[PDB]
Amino acid sequence: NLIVPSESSDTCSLIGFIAAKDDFSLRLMRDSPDIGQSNHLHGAEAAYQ
Amino acid sequence: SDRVLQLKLGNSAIVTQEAANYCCAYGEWPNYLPDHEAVAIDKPTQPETSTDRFYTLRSVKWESNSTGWWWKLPDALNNIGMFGQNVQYHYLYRSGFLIHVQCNATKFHQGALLVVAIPEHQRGAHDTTTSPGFNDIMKGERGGTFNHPYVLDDGTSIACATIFPHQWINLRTNNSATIVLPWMNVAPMDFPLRHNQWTLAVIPVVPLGTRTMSSVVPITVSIAPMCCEFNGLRHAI
Amino acid sequence: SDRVLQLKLGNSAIVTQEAANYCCAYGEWPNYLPDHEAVAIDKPTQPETSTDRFYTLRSVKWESNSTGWWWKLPDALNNIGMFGQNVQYHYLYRSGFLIHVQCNATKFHQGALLVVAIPEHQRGAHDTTTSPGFNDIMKGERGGTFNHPYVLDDGTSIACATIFPHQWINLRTNNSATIVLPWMNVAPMDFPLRHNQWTLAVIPVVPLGTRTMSSVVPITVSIAPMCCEFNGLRHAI
Amino acid sequence: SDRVLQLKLGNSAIVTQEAANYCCAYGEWPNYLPDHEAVAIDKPTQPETSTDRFYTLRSVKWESNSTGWWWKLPDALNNIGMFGQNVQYHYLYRSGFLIHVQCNATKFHQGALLVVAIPEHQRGAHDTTTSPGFNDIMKGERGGTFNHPYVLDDGTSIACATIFPHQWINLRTNNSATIVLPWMNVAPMDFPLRHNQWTLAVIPVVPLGTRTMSSVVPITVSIAPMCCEFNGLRHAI
Amino acid sequence: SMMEINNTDGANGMERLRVDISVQADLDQLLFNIPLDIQLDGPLRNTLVGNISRYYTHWSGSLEMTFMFCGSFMATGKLILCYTPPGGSCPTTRETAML
Amino acid sequence: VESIIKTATDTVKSEINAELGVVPSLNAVETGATSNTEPEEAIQTRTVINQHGVSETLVENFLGRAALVSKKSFEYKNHASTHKNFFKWTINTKSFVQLRRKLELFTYLRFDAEITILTTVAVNYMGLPDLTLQAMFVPTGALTPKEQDSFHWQSGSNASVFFKISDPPARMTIPFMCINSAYSVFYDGFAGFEKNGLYGINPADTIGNLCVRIVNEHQPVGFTVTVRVYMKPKHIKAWAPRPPRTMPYMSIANANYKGRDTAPNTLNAIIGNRASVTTMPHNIVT
Amino acid sequence: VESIIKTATDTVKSEINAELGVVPSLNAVETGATSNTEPEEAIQTRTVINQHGVSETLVENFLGRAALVSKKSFEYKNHASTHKNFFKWTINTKSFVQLRRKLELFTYLRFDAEITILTTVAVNYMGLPDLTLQAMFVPTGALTPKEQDSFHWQSGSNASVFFKISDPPARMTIPFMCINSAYSVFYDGFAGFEKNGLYGINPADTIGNLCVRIVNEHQPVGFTVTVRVYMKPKHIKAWAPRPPRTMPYMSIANANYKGRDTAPNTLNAIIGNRASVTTMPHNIVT
Amino acid sequence: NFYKDSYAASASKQDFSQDPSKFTEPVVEGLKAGAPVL
Amino acid sequence: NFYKDSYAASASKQDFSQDPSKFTEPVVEGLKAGAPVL
Numbered sequence A: 001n002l003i004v005p006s007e008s009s010d011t012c013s014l015i016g017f018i019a020a021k022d023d024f025s026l027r028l029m030r031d032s033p034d035i036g037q038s039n040h041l042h043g044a045e046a047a048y049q
Numbered sequence B, C, D: 001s002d003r004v005l006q007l008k009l010g011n012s013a014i015v016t017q018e019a020a021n022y023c024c025a026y027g028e029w030p031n032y033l034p035d036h037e038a039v040a041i042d043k044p045t046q047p048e049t050s051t052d053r054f055y056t057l058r059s060v061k062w063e064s065n066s067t068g069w070w071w072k073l074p075d076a077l078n079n080i081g082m083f084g085q086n087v088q089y090h091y092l093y094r095s096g097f098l099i100h101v102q103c104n105a106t107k108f109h110q111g112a113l114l115v116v117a118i119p120e121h122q123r124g125a126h127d128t129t130t131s132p133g134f135n136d137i138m139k140g141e142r143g144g145t146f147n148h149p150y151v152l153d154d155g156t157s158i159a160c161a162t163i164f165p166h167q168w169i170n171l172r173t174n175n176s177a178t179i180v181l182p183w184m185n186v187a188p189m190d191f192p193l194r195h196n197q198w199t200l201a202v203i204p205v206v207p208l209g210t211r212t213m214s215s216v217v218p219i220t221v222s223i224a225p226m227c228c229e230f231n232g233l234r235h236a237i
Numbered sequence E: 001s002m003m004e005i006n007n008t009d010g011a012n013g014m015e016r017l018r019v020d021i022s023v024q025a026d027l028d029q030l031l032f033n034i035p036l037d038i039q040l041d042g043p044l045r046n047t048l049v050g051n052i053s054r055y056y057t058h059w060s061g062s063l064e065m066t067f068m069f070c071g072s073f074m075a076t077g078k079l080i081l082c083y084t085p086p087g088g089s090c091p092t093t094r095e096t097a098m099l
Numbered sequence F, G: 001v002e003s004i005i006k007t008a009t010d011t012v013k014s015e016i017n018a019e020l021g022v023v024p025s026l027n028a029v030e031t032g033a034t035s036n037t038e039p040e041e042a043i044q045t046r047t048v049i050n051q052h053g054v055s056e057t058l059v060e061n062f063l064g065r066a067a068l069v070s071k072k073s074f075e076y077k078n079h080a081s082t083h084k085n086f087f088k089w090t091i092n093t094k095s096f097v098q099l100r101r102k103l104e105l106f107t108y109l110r111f112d113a114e115i116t117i118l119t120t121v122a123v124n125y126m127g128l129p130d131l132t133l134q135a136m137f138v139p140t141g142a143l144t145p146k147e148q149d150s151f152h153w154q155s156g157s158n159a160s161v162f163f164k165i166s167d168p169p170a171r172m173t174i175p176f177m178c179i180n181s182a183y184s185v186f187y188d189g190f191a192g193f194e195k196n197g198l199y200g201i202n203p204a205d206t207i208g209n210l211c212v213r214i215v216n217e218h219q220p221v222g223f224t225v226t227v228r229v230y231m232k233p234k235h236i237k238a239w240a241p242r243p244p245r246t247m248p249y250m251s252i253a254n255a256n257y258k259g260r261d262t263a264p265n266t267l268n269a270i271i272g273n274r275a276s277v278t279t280m281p282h283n284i285v286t
Numbered sequence H, I: 001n002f003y004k005d006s007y008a009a010s011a012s013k014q015d016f017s018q019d020p021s022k023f024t025e026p027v028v029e030g031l032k033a034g035a036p037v038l
């Protein structure tokens, strides 16, 4: 159990991290689903003016 | 240096940053049954990682008036994981055990637990001539509690219990106890469902106390069988 | 000389005095997974005798109008003995199989059974576009029966099924068939509960017949996993 | 051993008894511009001790609702001591930086600060297409604060900010962070008043908390330029 | 890099990057779980390994999760972190996860 | 520390550990170093000779793809009474998000750029004309044509490429041309000596202007002509990786952000929500 | 047992046989082995130096042929008010029976796949437009375009091939890309951890999605455009041959069968009937 | 093959190795010519 | 490359050198396996 004295906060935080080890391998490149656009970005058309 | 420790067996690992060295019962270490000591002639199965790994039992709460707890081996694990399956499907078993008892608190808490591994701890009943019954002895994963820890529930004494392999968990000093147990028996193997080689006893000789914020202080037991071997295969009991 | 045979694995043994040599699928023999082909990095458990032994399934009755029977592996054994326990407690498994089909009768009986081990026997359903369901495929220890053995229940043909590892049990000649199966898959190991590497099919191409006293003529299947390895230990599914 | 540290440059020195080793950005160390990488042909001035020394900036207060702070280099020091004078009198400058962030509290306090050195930290503005202005970027010795630390005020994320040279100040563990920064740019030297090579960011990922006596908990930044070189001498801007 | 484990309604910004644990009244308490597909949206998606991996379709290799306790020095405790290979439903009790 | 890696690392078998003073699974995130705990130290492993290649993640391959950087449609007709049969494009790699996000995974980049130009036409039916186009490279802020037929198109020194719609897409390589040793993908500074300049825009990182015209005089009818430009970096060197973009892009001139209206990728929550930290999404219900 | 065979085996002359204990023509089918009786042992043979080659039956050649795997016709026009100038195809080798039956003669197959794309057009007459098409490879269940002009076509990382109808068919090779050591032509299992998944469909064996669009904006009139995709496996390795398909195929998702209405290839009779087992079809009537 | 990836190469029609016995005679004990099989 | 300018050449996909430690372990004092970090 988490055990703390009266003057310590009785609710504490954990920060979790993750990473790949060097036995990792990735294959078959594809476009990332994490970014996309519906219209021209602001200023894009001004590059033609 | 002798206060930090990592134990790794199979797919399990445990670390402690507040240990007190660790005990090897009678200065021995677990090992597989040699040919010159073997009796059962069938080829044994040695599961290795599926059974020689840490099994954590349900925790218990250390209270101001607690008398102590006990867990018998292999009974406590006879129904847990692949160790439990091998035990149920085989007439004979053999193994050592790596015991790790855990209990942390606060630098404002005090208390001392005797953590002792008792070989052949034959319990006695109090104030009656009737011998203890099956249900008084076989508690399984839950374990039991001491009625009269002062005499180890067997008419002897906890005072001299230090003659058995042990460590202590003195809150101001450490937060865990570790004991390595070799196979302990008069026979090379045994029937796991009717005989317990060792009994893990955790007894608060000095009660839990503090004047700071009151919190539930648990005691947790993790046990890893070592060098497991099973013979006499059949159906599950 | 090639008509008598004894198979011994673990605590099990089988003899036949009317065999027909025996088949080693694709001329191979089971073996443990070598380091240069391994993928899962955890240390595997190799139970040996507790799993690499003969498991006899419930028999079936060979009748004058029978269409044939099938058993998928490892499904048929996923709930039997210690092999079943290891399968349930581990995400990954790997093994070969020693198959022995048994069927005796009388020198006045006639009949011929095709005993074939089919790799990846993906069943098809009859007269519908709907794919076979989970319960149509996973029969377990009981196995299933052929609806249209003529096309191996997959739109192909039993006539050309001899392209797969097989033997026959022709009553006037032999009373048993034996086939040794190596690990057969595109991966070094697999999840045992959702994929069957092999399908044992026993089909009466020539029906059972006689003019002597009528008796129940059973067909029995005994299967011994070989070189079992399990990885990815966790709780039982 | 790796918890105590003394940094000494010029007439300045700093010690910490609760460090966590220290970071050398990208495993590099500051150095003077070699002849084979030089562009400006005038003989540079290398002030050494008058500029390569620790400059302590005004402290900031870590509050329960703080979002984080940042200081851009060399902007933060462009008006401090002899480093500031050389910067104002020369068109070109070059240097590395030794960063030491300080924050102590109590064994009853909790909190975690990410201390990261970001190369080319180009800020973005929130909810507008208008680019950040000169005064939004050049804060000098006072530094600025994060509006949305969650996305590093640039539409990315603090979660992945660990890809940059960094350390953490986790109150129960250490009371200071140290990062050594080499010259980081695509050119051998640069005009110090319009471009900032690095941005020091200190962000409380885990807020300051305690139940003991409340006190003002400051965060202090001390920065020492390293291997300073200046070219293009003229009047002060 | 930081996993967004507390990806829940009510958790805003950086609150989503930390998991709070409290002093418990009961034993063997489940504190949190984490879905593991680094190729799908969840706590692992916006990480260095997650972001780069999503520019690909196939992956192989071991992953490592490191947790830093950020309570006060006077706070103590023991936690058990378990990885359960696929096959069944996510464990909800320590006795099961511990296997 | 540096070495040649052609495959993922192998795994060595490991035994039981019970050593005092040795705790490989414990680390100190505060140091800034990533955990060095090896699988062999966390669990018992077997030996594995790993043959998995690592070449598809080489930076050269990761960024080595022809990505769309410009798309412009205009009317080809008699403009007697808007892009009058030609247009000018200030080259930039910030208009299309897929290429932009990948380049922004790095702080500095050095590379040569292979440019491919694809042209398509549509009648505003009697067939599609096989027009000849001219793409002239005009340096930074340099003099660009103002008419489809101005003298500027004589291209005495500027490089010009003439191509037909019926030919394969035009292609040529622009060398790494930065005045510095590498392009600045991000620039925490102001491009001028005064205080009113643009923030985050280092002129040194603008490859230049691309002026494209239809060489043919207008036809009796009008057509819509679309020109697509693709860029593929090669001979790449990259430095200092960065946190990936999460918030949608707003402008090509800055990193301004707003976030989606609702998660995922909202300013308040990057990852989509689940009911609680003990709720397992996609839990297997067997 | 293994050896190099480049021609059919020769025949050796044989003499009269009358040996006790030697019966080469007798065998035991029950063993599962095929008869080993040689011609020389069954009859008196002469010597024959056989020079017949065996290369046309090499697996590489048997499967090494570009076979049609996809054929899609759609309307190219203004879809203001169905495949709107583009389509998406989940790659599979089960739609056209000739290729399917051959691949299904094997259990496992490892091969690289040469893809050839053929395009034809027809007016719905004033001539045929030489359109530019884009074929983008989008991985398994990955994000596909929803409009002829969506941003997805910018193809920042996905491989895209742009080709004209007037050019020879487009062509490229997709490597053996299975996550396993070989593709599973047949799969006796379920692709998911739950029980409701699809049977016989291992996702690992789906090469991916092929998204094809006409790049040109629509013309004033409509056209019918048909795209045909051909696949040729090469660098082939094959394992465990299987019984050939006899019943007509019913679905691309399974091996379901029904059979023809009447023989041949009816569920009840694969071979066509003859009057009796003593009736010789095509008997020579001299 | 002028391409950098070996899988792009033309076909490989030169593997004349064969072992029919894995299909024709997968019996553990070899069958001798002329001798009774059983 | 038949062009006279080297920058016109095809891609260079042969640089397999790596040094993850500049990102994973940029600490001045190396961390030994098993030993307490602090």
Ligand SMILES: CC(=O)N[C@@H]1[C@@H](O)[C@H](O[C@@H]2O[C@H](CO[C@]3(C(=O)O)C[C@H](O)[C@@H](NC(C)=O)[C@H]([C@H](O)[C@H](O)CO)O3)[C@H](O)[C@H](O)[C@H]2O)[C@@H](CO)O[C@H]1O
Pocket: A033, A034, A035, A036, E040, E041, E042, F260, F263, F264, F265, F271, F272, F273
């Ligand atoms: C398509 C499918 O198989 N299932 C759909 C559910 O996933 C979907 O529920 C939402 O799914 C979201 C997925 O997260 C991403 C993703 O595609 O991986 C995260 C990306 O970074 C994000 N990209 C951008 C540029 O914002 C992307 C994008 O927002 C969506 O594709 C647009 O819809 O989403 C996420 O987990 C959500 O929190 C979750 O609710 C349901 C919704 O009804 O539909 C299923 O078909």
Ligand SMILES: CC(=O)N[C@@H]1[C@@H](O)[C@H](O[C@@H]2O[C@H](CO[C@]3(C(=O)O)C[C@H](O)[C@@H](NC(C)=O)[C@H]([C@H](O)[C@H](O)CO)O3)[C@H](O)[C@H](O)[C@H]2O)[C@@H](CO)O[C@H]1O
Pocket: G260, G263, G264, G265, G271, G272, G273
């Ligand atoms: C074409 C010719 O020279 N003679 C014709 C006769 O052969 C035909 O009588 C029928 O012939 C059938 C032939 O068997 C196959 C074949 O073509 O070899 C067997 C194939 O597997 C089958 N294919 C499929 C996909 O089902 C194929 C097919 O059914 C037919 O081509 C379709 O008509 O037939 C078979 O032996 C029949 O049993 C037999 O009656 C007569 C019929 O009038 O016409 C002759 O011209």
